[PDB]
């Protein structure tokens, strides 16, 4: 029970985005590092309780 | 490398700084994006399988 | 133009019929069927491109 006495800190990143102002930068040919970059969303939307 | 301010750690944030050379921009000028600016739309052939209720599109 | 008009709307509304019957958990789905097909640089995937 010694693990769960002191409250652990969750590091939430600062919310910033500039797609609404300059919609020209986001177009039909996006840049991605991995080719399996849409797998995690496609998994959640199909099976949420997993 | 470590930095301190107000007796607390000062951390570096943002993107990874590169060594900008004269060649790195003018190779994109040499490239010019020479892809002829012509809206070529490629098709998708629908493929039927066991269920038939839901549709599935293939690349060719 | 009357014959060219009916030819275009009949082509679109037929394909939107069998596009509405695909699950979101897939490569070419409801949201991302325009991006992969387009091989140009339009401002925004709307109007005549879709």
Curated annotation (Swiss-Prot), chain B:
Localization, UniProt: Virion
Cysteine-cysteine disulfides: none
Ranges in a coiled coil: none
Function field: Capsid protein self-assembles to form an icosahedral capsid with a T=2 symmetry, about 40 nm in diameter, and consisting of 60 capsid proteins asymmetric dimers. The capsid encapsulates the genomic dsRNA and the polymerase and remains intact following cell entry to protect the dsRNA from degradation and to prevent unfavorable antiviral responses in the host cell during all the replication cycle of the virus. Nascent transcripts are transcribed within the structural confines of the virion and are extruded into the cytoplasm.
Family the entry assigns: Belongs to the totivirus major capsid protein family.
Protein name from the UniProt record: Major capsid protein
Origin species: Saccharomyces cerevisiae virus L-BC (ScV-L-BC)
Gene giving rise to this polypeptide: gag
Residues of the full protein shown: 599 to 658 of 697
């Amino acid at each position: 029970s010694a693990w769960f006495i002191n409250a652990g800190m969750v590091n939430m990143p600062t919310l910033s985005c500039a797609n609404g102002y300059y919609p020209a930068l986001t177009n039909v040919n996006p840049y991605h590092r991995l080719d399996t970059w849409k797998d995690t969303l496609n998994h959640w939307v199909a099976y949420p309780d997993m | 490398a470590a930095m301190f301010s107000r007796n607390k750690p000062l951390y570096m944030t943002g993107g990874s700084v590169r060594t900008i050379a004269t060649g790195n921009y003018r190779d994109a000028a040499e490239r010019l994006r020479a892809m002829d600016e012509t809206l070529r739309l490629k098709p998708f052939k629908i493929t039927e399988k066991l269920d038939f209720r839901v549709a599935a599109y293939a690349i060719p | 133009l009357f014959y060219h008009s009916v030819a275009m709307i009949e082509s679109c509304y037929v394909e939107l019929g069998n596009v509405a019957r695909v699950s979101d958990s897939d490569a070419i789905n409801k949201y991302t069927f325009t991006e992969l097909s387009v091989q140009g640089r339009p401002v925004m995937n709307r109007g005549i491109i879709v």
